[PDB]
Design a protein around this ligand. Structure first.
Ligand SMILES: Nc1ncnc2c1ncn2[C@@H]1O[C@H](CSCC[C@H](N)C(=O)O)[C@@H](O)[C@H]1O
Lengths: 5, 693
């Protein structure tokens, strides 16, 4: 679960 | 089977140079150029599908880094691609405009970056860059060979979709009296571009009368936008085909109309008749004189009385959207377009779709970004993007450009990929912007950040704008009069400049009409009761209806009748203090019959001039603010003449886009248009030459 932000 | 970096490490010094922040949030022990995940090797520059959260769409990224973290974990860094859904456009990918859809295989390269454990990598993707301006065939060949493609970038700031003497025609939709277009052309002139409003469309006859007076050369059409669109369509075919009481000439054309069923009509002037005798006859009623129809079409086509596709460089508009605030803030949200009349938004984009202008400027209220989670705002933007326009969105506060008001509006740029996308001009006045930004579009406010302190001009107040104007009364029938004397302030010196000084070429060489005249200095004529009331409002800062006889403040700042005094009545026998005033804002309002002061500003100049629910009474004179005073507050040059009944004149001013705002935008347009723009910063600082003297 990459984490885009 | 467990992810492992491959090849030798990037030279320690080189890694240090390339990626400084990693040495000295995540920190690196060393960088590699490659990694192997599930039996497939990836390299810096490879484009890759990345695993996201449970049940969320895979991210799409360009690998920029491969490094071992100080936590001895294996990471990779990506510069993300946005799917159209992934942008601000969101759920509005599903819209289409005249057959223009969002290609699901079109992405946009962003500068957003994220780190990840190597095991999130899913697979490689063939993503190619297609030059928007490359030849059409090659372009299809390229797109043919790929999994995904991109022709533009996406930036979160100002929702920017962007590529990776001269004359220009402009078309003003929903033109009103021409606030936006007038200003645009003026700014443009300063850029060195000669931009002229060639056609204007508005269904209020008085607004048109105003625009046509100040811009004689422009083809001012008093009709509905949708009718104008239809007319255009039929005009196309007419050009392709090129076609007693006696008919001398055909002077006009229109499609449909107020009483008339759809279909073309021509305006005929009859032999021996003065104008004002000309009338509209249907197209087939004139099958009699097909030659005269010819005279008109060929003649109209050469003077370009109406635009065919390609004829219009710029389109600006302020399509009305109502029911998106107040009582209507909460109604009809699911299909806002079908609903009510947010419909003009569709029509606007329909005309853009039909004309395909090099630039699009779309103005509107901030609520389009709030109502139904910014639906209308997204819709406008989505349309431009599906039509393959570059685009950006920004919010501009009028007072920031030299006006005694705080009028925040939304402006949407569009530009063909063959054109340079315009920027937003920074504030020139030290008014401060608050948290007014819709968290949906949090990054579209055009303002300087606090981090940067730049010296800006002192914020303008009401006195700064109207202190030089001569006294007049409740009833003032003269729409043309003499100034009492010279202007007193820098602002006053500016709005009293002639058309030439303003670089306003509407009348070409030579001065226009009304030079040095005070126009429309007339207030709403209050009826005898209202007039009697304002006459009783003390002249002092903060004065309002509470200052009227027989009223007092009860506990909790709630207005009351003073038990000691019986209701007062005017000569008419009506109450001096009206009932609505007593209940307005739960009886806590200070607005009814409020008097302005020189100290103050008018947050938003509005279309109605009644003193009932607003502070609109002149500081010293027993009257409401005059039309011209509202005009100045709105940044109109003093020479810009308004026509129609007074109420209609107020409506015109109140609807308008603040001229200085439009002028600033005009400048940015001029520069982008002339290719005299600079690299890709969303914001542009106007030069010294602009701003003032
Ligand atoms: N259905 C319609 N067809 C054409 N014009 C319309 C219209 N509905 C509203 N309008 C015109 O909407 C303008 C929208 S207010 C526009 C102010 C203008 N942009 C300026 O800066 O001066 C007015 O002309 C309003 O009457």
């Amino acid at each position: 679960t990459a984490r885009k932000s | 089977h467990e992810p492992e970096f491959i090849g030798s490490p990037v030279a320690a010094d080189e890694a240090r140079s390339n990626w400084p922040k990693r040495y000295g949030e995540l920190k690196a022990r060393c960088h590699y150029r490659s990694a192997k995940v599930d039996n497939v090797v990836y390299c810096l520059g490879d484009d890759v599908y990345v695993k996201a959260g449970e049940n969320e769409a895979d991210y799409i990224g360009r690998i920029t880094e491969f490094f071992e973290g100080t936590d001895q974990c294996h990471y990779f860094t990506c510069r993300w691609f946005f799917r159209a859904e992934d942008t601000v456009i969101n759920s509005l990918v599903s819209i289409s405009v005249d057959g223009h859809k969002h290609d699901p295989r079109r992405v946009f390269l962003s500068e957003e970056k994220n780190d990840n454990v190597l095991d999130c990598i899913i697979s490689k993707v063939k993503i190619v860059h297609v030059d928007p301006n490359m030849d059409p065939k090659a372009k299809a060949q390229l797109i043919e060979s790929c999994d995904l493609y991109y022709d533009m970038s996406y930036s979160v700031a100002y929702s920017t979709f962007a590529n990776i003497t001269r004359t220009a025609t402009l078309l003003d939709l929903y033109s009103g009296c021409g606030g936006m277009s007038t200003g645009l052309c003026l700014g443009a002139a300063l850029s060195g571009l000669k931009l002229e409003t060639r056609w204007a469309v508005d269904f209020n006859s008085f607004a048109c009368q105003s625009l046509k007076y100040n811009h004689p050369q422009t083809e001012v059409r008093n009709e509905k936008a949708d009718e104008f669109l239809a007319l255009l369509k039929e005009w196309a075919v007419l050009c392709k085909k090129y076609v007693e009481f006696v008919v001398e000439k055909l002077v006009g054309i229109c499609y449909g109309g107020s009483d008339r069923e759809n279909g073309i009509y021509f305006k005929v002037q009859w032999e021996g008749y003065g104008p004002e005798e000309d009338t509209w006859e249907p197209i087939d009623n004139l099958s009699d004189c097909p030659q005269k129809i010819r005279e008109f079409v060929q003649e109209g086509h050469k003077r370009k009385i109406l635009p065919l596709p390609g004829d219009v460089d710029v389109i600006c508009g302020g399509p009305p959207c109502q029911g998106i605030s107040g009582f209507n803030r909460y109604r009809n949200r699911d299909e806002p377009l079908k609903d009510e009349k947010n419909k003009q938004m569709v029509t606007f984009m329909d005309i853009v779709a039909y004309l395909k202008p090099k630039y699009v400027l779309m103005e509107n209220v901030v609520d389009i970004l709030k109502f139904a989670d910014g639906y209308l705002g997204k819709y406008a933007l989505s349309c431009l993007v599906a039509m393959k326009y570059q685009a950006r969105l920004g919010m501009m506060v009028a007072g920031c450009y030299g006006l005694p008001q705080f009028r925040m509006r939304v402006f949407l740029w569009g530009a063909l990929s063959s054109m340079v996308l315009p920027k937003y001009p920074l504030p020139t006045y030290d008014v401060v912007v608050r948290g007014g930004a819709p968290n949906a579009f949090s990054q579209c406010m055009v303002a300087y950040d606090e981090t940067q302190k730049p010296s800006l001009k002192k914020a303008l107040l009401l006195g700064d704008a109207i202190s030089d104007l001569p006294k007049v009364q409740n009833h003032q029938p003269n729409d043309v009069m003499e100034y009492g004397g010279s202007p007193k302030t820098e602002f006053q010196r500016y709005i009293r400049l002639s058309r030439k000084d303003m670089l306003d070429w509407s009348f070409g060489e030579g001065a226009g009409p009304d030079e040095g005249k005070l126009l429309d200095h007339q207030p709403l004529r209050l009826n005898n009761d209202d007039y009697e009331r304002v006459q009783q409002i003390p002249v002092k800062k903060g004065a309002n209806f509470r200052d009227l006889k027989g009223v007092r403040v009860g506990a909790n700042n709630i207005v009351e009748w003073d038990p000691e005094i019986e209701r007062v009545k005017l000569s008419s026998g009506k109450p001096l203090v009206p009932d609505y005033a007593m209940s307005f804002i739960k009886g806590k309002s200070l607005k009814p019959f409020g008097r302005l002061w020189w100290d103050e500003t008018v947050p938003t100049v509005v279309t109605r001039a009644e003193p009932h629910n607003q502070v609109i009474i002149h500081p010293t004179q027993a009257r409401v603010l005059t039309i011209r005073e509202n005009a100045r507050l709105q940044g109109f040059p003093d020479y810009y003449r308004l026509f129609g009944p007074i109420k209609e004149k107020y409506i015109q001013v109140g609807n308008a886009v603040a001229v200085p705002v439009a002028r600033a935008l005009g400048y940015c347009l001029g520069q982008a248009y002339l290719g005299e723009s600079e690299g890709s910063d969303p914001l542009y600082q106007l030069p010294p030459s602009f701003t003032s003297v």
